[model samples]
Target: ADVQQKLAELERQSGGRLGVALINTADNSQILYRADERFAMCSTSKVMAAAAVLKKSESEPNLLNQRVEIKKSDLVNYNPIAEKHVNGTMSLAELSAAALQYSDNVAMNKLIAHVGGPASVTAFARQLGDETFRLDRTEPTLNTAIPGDPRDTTSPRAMAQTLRNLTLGKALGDSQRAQLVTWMKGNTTGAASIQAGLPASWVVGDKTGSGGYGTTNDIAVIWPKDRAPLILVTYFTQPQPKAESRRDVLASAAKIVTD
Candidate 1:
């Protein structure tokens, strides 16, 4: 409850549903506001989709080295990275990075297939003890984000918890662990949201998700100069508006938590 009052005030100002969760991984202290309420995961689900693939690699050894042949039909509008390889091939690891660091749609569907499917991903999160994360569809379709539909949605707290497990737990081997964080750090899509709200001196690893109806989300692991790492998840949705406004909600929420 650390920043609950200011958070609620910001929610009121935006006239939208904003769920924010902040956890101090070192001490397990938390700040939760509508933390368990479900919101569209949008592209953020790629984080789990990629890590689930990483977890599988830990057991399969060379799983990530495999490649997928892409057909022209596989291409989608916003898939920048995937477009480059149409009629060619992308390694499993490359698809994961495309989805994570680029939020590329076609790459996510391939990773969803690489890891088996939507159910397998949900199961992976459950295996990590997440009670509220679920993926009912692949990308483009999953981004439908119908206002309160439970499909393809998760609670802010649940996402933060899953991230904590992946980034700090034994789910991934050493290189696998560093690789996921590495991808998150290199993300090109979230500058105005969670990253913008932080101090210039601190370090951050994050993922962003976008959808219809003003659904814009950011989940992050933040490292302050001399303090322990902190995990933050902010999921937002409201009646349709411009994309930037949704990002504004996340930035404001991040600042609120910092205060």
Candidate 2:
């Protein structure tokens, strides 16, 4: 396929560090594109972070509206809004909005604490049946564990598979799935990947996460009018030569696959 070849060329152009795993969400049995390996997921953990919350909602009933107090602990790291206004209390709904809508670190940290801490999140990942996902477990900041061991981590393939399952209604119950879709639709970051390359008014769902030092990832659902919806995962880290270069590459890949 031309798309496949174009992806291979895209990998070459990435300075040999682009890893992507794009799948047919309709079937979940094929790969549309792949490269060197699955890229290390930086903030891409946010996808699983948010998913952990939704999966819990399956049993918690009111996890969405649950009022979690905003404390100084919640106001840790890179979050402009929540850090500045840490005293003001907010619901899990508002916190989630901050986490997903703005990629607010403080909001995510707070939500993680509220959701029975990191152990619960890890348990949820296991419930979803992923062998690679695990907590990084560093002290002082235990929101979503970073990769302490390289082997216990996420990849573009696993990222897409997680998303494919979510889309195909495998991981969550009806209510949970509906809420997951809603949260994805409210994603407030990385509008350029699948969404940027698609038709206006199309129902696109996405989540974008980035760790410090130029790690950015985009996982999304694309619903085209004449075809089954597609799931795309773009993960890239450790590339240099131009900062805006990777963004351009990913945006270009998105355009090609959708076209």
Candidate 3:
């Protein structure tokens, strides 16, 4: 059976395009559909941002504990953690967790700055040998999700490769790896998407992203019972006046790949 065809029909029914990738590390099985196309990364860029911080901390072991003040100007929409911490000091580790666990907009920008800039996140991904993942803007700007513009975008292939390396490969140390995975596992944003399809016994960690143009995305590393691991990414975009996110489409795609 052709998985892409099934996913395409799901996209058609959902009124959006789907960029999906899945790699089962157990047997090196694979699936790719529009996986090479650029789609707005939305807040998914937080993963790389946090990874970059953790990577930098390897040399500067004290980096994660560095105190940071959340500026009032840093606050943006949906920043639960950032809004609460305005003018208060938060540790670099706290900021990184806020970005990943809560999708805090302000915390994301803070991490980007902590690691140098948006470009630093890209450089970090490049260091992981990911040629297609790019972080071009921060916060509200990156969420623009401009149609046909490649800025602030990543192909599913690139993202999958990056996650594979970050989580399953040796790019991150054991402590760094566990910390990153802990943040992802605790993420509260993507329950309706990929998480909706998996059995409770399976271990799954994921980051969700949203943006303009009805873009909603979820990238995950799954450890299925008695299997090695799987890296999956789903990026969704629909024609606009802006569209509602189709969490069901993401769920269906997950079901197709795993079942």
Candidate 4:
């Protein structure tokens, strides 16, 4: 089957909804699947939050080095790293890594607060020329179902373009960009989505987000052997009655990009 047909079949098997945006950075060739559909971004929004904090650090210089203590009340359910580090302290840089690398909700909350809340994060995204992506809430509230809130939502194409801009160094300085990419490359989560689709020889720098069992997203920069890196963003919104099957579907989509 052709790549398009394969993606279509995977969507049918998902029993939910899928949105995808793929870009070949070499020639700027592109493919999109439901690219305009917006959905809750979950922890994926951390990328924007981190960017906002990093931008502020450019001015403050000391912001990233400042330490903040984690309060006992800051622990939220489903957070792995924060649960182990309750009452511990972490610098802003450390918190950013914990949030991006492990999708730690507690660290994410701290970062959001450091940047003056979600409004600041969304504003920074707007400054990057994105209109459809937003971050109006934090942590637990941001991931939960809201009947008509696009506040925590983003379209696949929007995110893909944002990634493209970052990769092209349109907004951030060299060191900041490298730091962000490094943390994503070291991400300790989401082994079953896009990463699972590639050949063992390929390397993927990715960030993953999940909202319960319904929403799953993987945004990545994939480096194939001797080829320029490609950007791939896949988002599955709504409930997946067969969650594992949906993952397999995502792997299939990733295979198309790699092929």
TM-score, cand. 4 vs. native: 0.93
Question: Candidate 3: which stretches are off by over 4 Å?
Answer: none
lDDT, candidate 1, 1-259, per-residue tens: 4478889899999988899999997788999999988899998899999999998998898888898998889887688998889888989989999999999989899989877899999999888888789999986889877876899999998898889888866777898999999999999888998988888898899999888778889999999899999999998988764544479889989988977
Which TM-score value belongs to model 1? 0.96
How high is each candidate's TM-score? 0.96, 0.83, 0.97, 0.93
Q: How far out, in Å, is residue 3 in model 1?
A: 1.8
Query: Once superposed on the true structure, which residue ranges of model 4 sit more than 4 Å away at CA?
Result: 145-149, 239-245
Q: After superposition, how far is residue 77 of candidate 4 from its true place, in Å?
A: 1.7
How do the candidates rank by TM-score, highest first? Answer: 3, 1, 4, 2
Model 1, position 186: C-alpha lDDT score:
90
Output the better candidate (1/2) by TM-score.
Answer: 1
lDDT of 4 by residue, 1-259 (tens): 3766767777886667788899998888888888898877888888888888888888888889999888888988557777776777888998899888988898889998987888888888899899988887877888863434576899999999998777555588887888888888898886888989899888887888877447778888888899888999998865643343355556778987667
Candidate 2 — what's its lDDT?
0.64
What lDDT would each prediction earn against the true structure?
0.88, 0.64, 0.88, 0.81
lDDT of 3 by residue, 187-208 (tens): 8888888988788788889998
lDDT string, candidate 2, 1-259, tens digits: 7777877787677754455666664565545554334444545565566677777777888878877666776555568667766666677767676676677776777666666665676677777776556555322233222333252246667667777787655788887777777878877776766577667756777877554234556788777776677877776554442333246666666776666
- Residue 53, model 1: Cα distance from true site in angstroms: 0.7
Ranking by lDDT: 1, 3, 4, 2
Q: In candidate 3, what residue range of length 10 has the lowest lDDT sum?
A: 241-250
Candidate 1 clashes between residue pairs 3 or more apart in a chain or in different chains: none
